[PDB]
Amino acid sequence: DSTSDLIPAPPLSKVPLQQNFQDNQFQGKWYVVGLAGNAILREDKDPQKMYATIYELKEDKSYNVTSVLFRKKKCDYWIRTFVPGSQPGEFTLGNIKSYPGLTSYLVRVVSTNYNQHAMVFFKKVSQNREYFKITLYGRTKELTSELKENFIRFSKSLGLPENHIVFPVPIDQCID
């Protein structure tokens, strides 16, 4: 029982796909240097801490994806599987049945140079509500003003206001 009001997910026609996606070069550790989405809210009481996501390419060409977060003085690990979709750089969540209320989960790599930065679009339908987010990944915990401005411009092109765009604060715990 609830009421919720969400910015509509953009059509996938507004979400570019990285041309010539190289699955092997996308592997390894990425820091989440920016987050934007219809359920992302800027919060000054506890500013969002940086977390890291590790992509491991399996023999079957799916990714094992592990996120590491620092929560309540401990390292929290979330492991899931990204299964190759219709085109290189697109994925769906493996074993969708195992997530209560989840009916769809889509991943699209928008842009990357593999060795510094990536932007990744996520869309999911959970309890019949449609959520989307854009993750700005860095190989380091800092990125240039130009890459952050490009991320803001792309996020606003998908209908997100300033207060749905956050830059998690770098930490050392868990993600080094």
Ligand SMILES: O=C(NCCCN(CCCCN(CCCNC(=O)c1cccc(=O)n1O)C(=O)c1cccc(=O)n1O)C(=O)c1cccc(=O)n1O)c1cccc(=O)n1O
């Ligand atoms: O709107 C989105 N995200 C921003 C709000 C995050 N949040 C704020 C506290 C969440 C803290 N955790 C979650 C870590 C553990 N999670 C899970 O065991 C999990 C199970 C099933 C589906 C799923 O998605 N997760 O994460 C993250 O920091 C975290 C790290 C890495 C990847 C990641 O995805 N998350 O969230 C939410 O509670 C939330 C609200 C609405 C939808 C939603 O999926 N989540 O997690 C969104 C849109 C489209 C796809 C998508 O996956 N997400 O998250």
Ligand SMILES: [La+3]
């Ligand atoms: La999530």
